[PDB]
Amino acid sequence: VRQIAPGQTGKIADYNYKLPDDFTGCVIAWNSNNLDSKGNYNYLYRL
Amino acid sequence: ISNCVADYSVLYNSASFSTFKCYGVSPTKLNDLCFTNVYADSFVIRGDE
C-alpha cells in the first residue's frame, strides 16, 4: 500500500500502477480479508 | 563489501521487505553511482522497535 504515492519505487509503482508527481486527488484504502480469502488465486500482478 | 558489481534494483524491486528507506540518495539513482567504504550491519529486533 506504501507504493501508491507520488515519486516512489517498488514494482507495483514501477511495473503496475504509477502516479505522477503533480497529483491532485485522494488515495483511500481498507483491508478486505473477509471478502478476498479462501486460497484465492484471482489477483494477478506483473513481476 | 568491496571490489564488486552491485545491482540494487533486484533488491528493491523484488520486495521481500517491509521498510526500504534511503537517506542522502534516492533509490532510483543507486544503479548509476559508485560507492566508497561500503559496510553492512545486521541484527534482529522487535517489531515496535
From Swiss-Prot, chain A:
Q: Where is this region: Immunodominant HLA epitope recognized by the CD8+?
A: 40-47
> What is the top-level taxon of the source organism?
Viruses
Primary role: Attaches the virion to the cell membrane by interacting with host receptor, initiating the infection. The major receptor is host ACE2. When S2/S2' has been cleaved, binding to the receptor triggers direct fusion at the cell membrane. When S2/S2' has not been cleaved, binding to the receptor results in internalization of the virus by endocytosis using host TFRC and GRM2 and leading to fusion of the virion membrane with the host endosomal membrane. Alternatively, may use NRP1/NRP2 and integrin as entry receptors.
Organism classification, top ranks? Viruses, Riboviria, Orthornavirae, Pisuviricota, Pisoniviricetes
What result is annotated for mutating residue 38 to T? In strain: Omicron/BQ.1.1
Substituting residue 45 to F results in: Decreased HLA binding to NF9 epitope. Increased binding affinity to human ACE2
Consequence when changing residue 11 to N:
In strain: Beta/B.1.351, Omicron/BA.1, Omicron/BA.2, Omicron/BA.2.12.1, Omicron/BA.2.75, Omicron/BA.4, Omicron/BA.5, Omicron/BQ.1.1, Omicron/XBB.1.5, Omicron/EG.5.1; May enhance affinity to human ACE2 receptor
Outline the subunit composition: Binds to host ACE2. RBD also interacts with the N-linked glycan on 'Asn-90' of ACE2. Cleavage of S generates a polybasic C-terminal sequence on S1 that binds to host Neuropilin-1 (NRP1) and Neuropilin-2 (NRP2) receptors. Interacts with host integrin alpha-5/beta-1 (ITGA5:ITGB1) and with ACE2 in complex with integrin alpha-5/beta-1 (ITGA5:ITGB1). May interact via cytoplasmic c-terminus with M protein. May interact (via N-terminus) with host bilirubin and biliverdin, thereby preventing antibody binding to the SARS-CoV-2 spike NTD via an allosteric mechanism.
Effect of mutating residue 44 to R: Increased resistance to neutralizing antibodies. Decreases HLA binding to NF9 epitope. Increased binding affinity to human ACE2
Q: What is this protein called?
A: Spike protein S1
Curated annotation (Swiss-Prot), chain B:
Effect upon mutating residue 19 to A: In strain: Omicron/BA.2, Omicron/BA.2.12.1, Omicron/BA.4, Omicron/BA.5, Omicron/BQ.1.1, Omicron/XBB.1.5, Omicron/EG.5.1
Region Integrin-binding motif: start and end of each range?
A: 46-48
The UniProt function text for this chain reads: Attaches the virion to the cell membrane by interacting with host receptor, initiating the infection. The major receptor is host ACE2. When S2/S2' has been cleaved, binding to the receptor triggers direct fusion at the cell membrane. When S2/S2' has not been cleaved, binding to the receptor results in internalization of the virus by endocytosis using host TFRC and GRM2 and leading to fusion of the virion membrane with the host endosomal membrane. Alternatively, may use NRP1/NRP2 and integrin as entry receptors.
The entry's stated outcome for residue 48 to N is: In strain: Omicron/BA.2, Omicron/BA.2.12.1, Omicron/BA.2.75, Omicron/BA.4, Omicron/BA.5, Omicron/BQ.1.1, Omicron/XBB.1.5, Omicron/EG.5.1; complete loss of interaction with host integrins
**Quaternary state and partners of this protein?**
Binds to host ACE2. RBD also interacts with the N-linked glycan on 'Asn-90' of ACE2. Cleavage of S generates a polybasic C-terminal sequence on S1 that binds to host Neuropilin-1 (NRP1) and Neuropilin-2 (NRP2) receptors. Interacts with host integrin alpha-5/beta-1 (ITGA5:ITGB1) and with ACE2 in complex with integrin alpha-5/beta-1 (ITGA5:ITGB1). May interact via cytoplasmic c-terminus with M protein. May interact (via N-terminus) with host bilirubin and biliverdin, thereby preventing antibody binding to the SARS-CoV-2 spike NTD via an allosteric mechanism.
Q: Which residues of the full protein are shown?
A: 358 to 406 of 1273
Name this polypeptide is given: Spike protein S1
